[PDB]
UniProtKB/Swiss-Prot annotation:
Disease: Dystonia 3, torsion, X-linked: An X-linked dystonia-parkinsonism disorder. Dystonia is defined by the presence of sustained involuntary muscle contractions, often leading to abnormal postures. DYT3 is characterized by severe progressive torsion dystonia followed by parkinsonism. It has a well-defined pathology of extensive neuronal loss and mosaic gliosis in the striatum (caudate nucleus and putamen) which appears to resemble that in Huntington disease. Intellectual developmental disorder, X-linked, syndromic 33: A syndrome characterized by intellectual deficit, delayed psychomotor development, delayed speech and language, and characteristic facial features.
Top-rank lineage group of the source organism: Eukaryota
Free-text function comment from the UniProt entry: The TFIID basal transcription factor complex plays a major role in the initiation of RNA polymerase II (Pol II)-dependent transcription. TFIID recognizes and binds promoters with or without a TATA box via its subunit TBP, a TATA-box-binding protein, and promotes assembly of the pre-initiation complex (PIC). The TFIID complex consists of TBP and TBP-associated factors (TAFs), including TAF1, TAF2, TAF3, TAF4, TAF5, TAF6, TAF7, TAF8, TAF9, TAF10, TAF11, TAF12 and TAF13. TAF1 is the largest component and core scaffold of the TFIID complex, involved in nucleating complex assembly.
Subunit details: Component of the TFIID basal transcription factor complex, composed of TATA-box-binding protein TBP, and a number of TBP-associated factors (TAFs), including TAF1, TAF2, TAF3, TAF4, TAF5, TAF6, TAF7, TAF8, TAF9, TAF10, TAF11, TAF12 and TAF13. Interacts with TAF7; the interaction is direct. TAF1, when part of the TFIID complex, interacts with C-terminus of TP53. (Microbial infection) Interacts with SV40 Large T antigen.
Region (Histone acetyltransferase (HAT)): 1-371
Residues forming coiled coils: none
Subcellular location as annotated: Nucleus
Recorded family membership: Belongs to the TAF1 family.
Listed transmembrane segments: none
Chain's gene name: TAF1
Entry's free-text remark on domains: The Bromo domain mediates interaction with histones that have acetylated lysine residues at specific positions. The second domain also recognizes and binds histones that are butyrylated and crotonylated.
Organism phylogeny: Eukaryota, Metazoa, Chordata, Craniata, Vertebrata
Effect of residue 64 to K: In a metastatic melanoma sample; somatic mutation
Post-translational modification note: Phosphorylated by casein kinase II in vitro.
Protein name: Transcription initiation factor TFIID subunit 1
DNA sequence: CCGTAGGCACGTCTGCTCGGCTCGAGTGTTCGATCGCGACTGAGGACGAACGCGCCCCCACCCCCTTTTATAGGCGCCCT
């Protein structure tokens, strides 16, 4: 059970962008430092980097007191955008080995760490302890390969994906800088996980699929309801211009569709007119709005449009998505293939063009039929096992390489 | 007679309707594969017929009964 932060659950901006142009899609999950137009750090010259130690201790203390003040047990702390800052709480880094994994979290979403352990035969004294995560004793593997007896494997686990992770040490040279309009802050950060290839648990839709079109529609609908809720006017009213600015690729006519059932156009002598909430229309509750569209569904959709943009950039037209190698790497194909195989509907290529590492240390998620048929499945498991073990060994290794001069 | 107001026209924006295109779903037909049945072949075992071997009988061949006579050494037995 995953409980996301309130800003994420509410699909607030900027945590959940309403629109992304080509540039943003290319930079998806890699935001570049952009200059500020105003505020302290818009100014030239040196700027102080501030310590956070007193602040970190204080927030931990305040949070624990709030915990004891009601009057123990479990509390949920991620209620406001302010609670999501890197400025307090314990922090880890996670570095993703896939250049563009099929699903990624937005800021404000939650994930668990699970410590998968397989018992040694006979008298097992229990799993080793880890600094992070909750131990899970598993007789069957949640991955493509099987755990060996006595093997502990850490992993990220959420509704988008499961992925093995490997704990490493941050280099002694490195610090985390947090940057706001107001100043820089610095934190020590020692724990950094390498993330291995994802096992997708959520299916990414194809471009212009019914699923995709239903999603943008519903997301637009949610944004609209939230606009009415934000309005302080009675009767509530919103401006077309504000919707168009958030959804610049929607025609005014398609926006009028979403508005015709809940609101009335009020014309004024000025090129700004209002849509006023109908007096017999009951605005959906917070709880009902949340049920309309989940953060996971937004993540699936984002994955599609970003991939679609990268494909266009590489010369692959919409008619391409009998199929080109590059199109096989698309998240709508890889997630579909992996999930089908998880349900026993087919097997996976494993060795193939969709291996995200390009060098045999990752899996190619491409459907092959279940179609000597005990040898067919034993060969699939053997190959899965080999790559599974290879990935764990390479990504957990502390060996120092050796810059490639090419 | 002069100035102000009103009306008309034009443009822009929004909404509604109509048409066209695309996508999806379902149903039907055709093709391929699998399964089943039958036939053939091969192998092994059993039964019957023919040939060979073994056993018994028969046949064949040779000498063994006797007589005669000349000759003469050695043996053993009868009663003188």
């Amino acid at each position: 059970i995953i409980q996301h932060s309130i800003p994420a659950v509410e699909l607030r901006q900027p945590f959940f962008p309403t629109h992304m142009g080509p540039i943003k899609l290319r930079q998806f999950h890699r935001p570049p430092l952009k200059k500020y137009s105003f505020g302290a750090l818009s100014q030239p010259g040196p700027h102080s980097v501030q310590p956070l130690l007193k602040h970190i201790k204080k927030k931990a203390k305040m949070r624990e007191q709030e915990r004891q003040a009601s009057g123990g047990g479990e509390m949920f702390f991620m209620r406001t955008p302010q609670d999501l800052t890197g400025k307090d709480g314990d922090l880890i880094l996670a570095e993703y080995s896939e250049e563009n994994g099929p699903l990624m979290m937005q800021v404000g979403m939650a994930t668990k760490i699970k410590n998968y352990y397989k018992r040694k035969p006979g008298k097992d004294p229990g799993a080793p302890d880890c600094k992070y995560g909750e131990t899970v004793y598993c007789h069957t593997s949640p991955f493509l390969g099987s755990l060996h007896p006595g093997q502990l494997l850490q992993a990220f686990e959420n509704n988008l994906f499961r992925a093995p992770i490997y704990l490493h040490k941050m280099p002694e040279t490195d610090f985390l800088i947090i940057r706001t309009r107001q100043g820089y802050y610095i934190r020590e950060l020692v724990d950094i996980f390498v993330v291995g290839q994802q096992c997708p648990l959520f299916e990414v839709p194809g471009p212009n699929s019914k699923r995709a079109n239903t999603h943008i529609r519903d997301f637009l609908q949610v944004f609209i309801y939230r606009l009415f809720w934000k309005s302080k006017d009675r009767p509530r009213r919103i401006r077309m211009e504000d919707i168009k600015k958030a959804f610049p690729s929607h025609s005014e006519s398609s926006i009028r569709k979403r508005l015709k059932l809940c609101a009335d156009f009020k014309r004024t002598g000025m090129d700004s007119n209002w849509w006023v909430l109908k007096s017999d229309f009951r605005l959906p509750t917070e709880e009902e709005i949340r049920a309309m569209v989940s953060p996971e569904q937004c993540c699936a959709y984002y994955s599609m449009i970003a991939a679609e943009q990268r494909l266009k950039d590489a010369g692959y037209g919409e008619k391409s998505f009998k199929i080109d190698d590059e199109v096989r790497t698309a998240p709508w194909n890889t997630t579909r293939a992996f999930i089908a195989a998880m349900k026993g509907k087919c097997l996976l290529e494993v060795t193939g063009v969709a291996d995200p590492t390009g060098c045999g240390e990752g899996f190619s998620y491409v459907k092959i039929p279940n179609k000597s048929v005990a040898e067919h499945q034993e060969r699939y498991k053997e190959e899965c096992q080999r790559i599974f073990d290879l990935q764990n060994k390479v990504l957990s290794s502390t060996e120092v390489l050796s810059t490639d001069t090419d």
